[PDB]
């Protein structure tokens, strides 16, 4: 179950980056499941309640989410646990 | 035929009594925890639907001047959308914050009321069952007019 089943929606979730002034694309971010925290850069998984801060250039949100946050449920149903398996190699 | 009339076992595996207890006293914790964070949960949904609104009504009014205005109150409109920007985001985080936290109570509460129900004490299974019946229609409810009131803000953009 996710923690913030508000943010469950994709549409809730990029309603949060109105104003982004970062290069992390902001839809891809939105639908690996972040939404913005208010603060910097900061997003949050809104299943697994994983944060992520520090973003680089042109960096994967689906990467980074499978790379910190594995276990997420949210990411397995929508990336399968190959891709999880294969981002830790 | 008719049952057969017994007794004498006490049924007094320490066990036993230690789950029936640990059963009415987090029923009752969880109980507790259910209306306290669902209180609170929706009177912050409440608090930050009206910061939607309010956003939405400068939104409406800043368009309705279009035009009208001329450079300094185009941009003093701007700077008071920019502080009610800012106070709905605030009551958003506050909001989030404390959805994970009735989660959290609402996942205890099913427990309980498992509990209760797998050691046979209907009457607390049921009261508990009723309650997180109710404290979750209730807030689904108040979350959907919080999305109405979202997607005017979103439709005023």
């Known amino acids: 179950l996710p923690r913030n089943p508000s943010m469950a929606d994709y549409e809730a979730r990029i309603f949060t980056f109105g104003t982004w002034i970062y290069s992390v694309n902001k839809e891809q971010l939105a639908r690996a499941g972040f939404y913005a925290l208010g603060e910097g850069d900061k997003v949050k998984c809104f299943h697994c309640g994983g944060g992520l801060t520090d973003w680089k250039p042109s960096e994967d949100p689906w990467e980074q989410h499978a790379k910190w946050y594995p276990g997420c449920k949210y990411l397995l149903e929508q990336k399968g646990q190959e891709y999880i398996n294969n981002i830790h190699l | ?98 959805e994970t936290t009735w989660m959290t109570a609402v996942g205890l509460s099913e427990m309980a009321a498992e509990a209760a129900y797998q050691t046979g004490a209907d009457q607390a299974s049921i009261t508990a069952r009723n309650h997180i019946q109710l404290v979750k229609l209730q807030v689904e409810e108040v979350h959907q007019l919080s999305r109405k009131a979202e997607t005017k803000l979103a439709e005023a953009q």
């Not at chain 2, 036993?16 to 059963?23: F, I, Y």
């Open chain 2, 1 to 98: 035929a008719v049952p057969i009339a017994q007794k004498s076992e006490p049924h007094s595996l320490s066990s036993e009594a230690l789950m029936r207890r640990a059963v009415s006293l987090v029923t009752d914790s969880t109980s507790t925890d259910l209306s306290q964070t669902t209180y609170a949960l929706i009177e912050a949904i409440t608090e930050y639907t009206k910061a939607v609104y309010t956003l939405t009504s400068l939104y409406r009014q800043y368009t309705s001047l279009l035009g009208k205005m001329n450079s300094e109150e185009e941009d003093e409109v701007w700077q008071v959308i920019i502080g009610a920007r800012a106070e709905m985001t605030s009551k958003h985080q506050e909001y989030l914050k404390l």
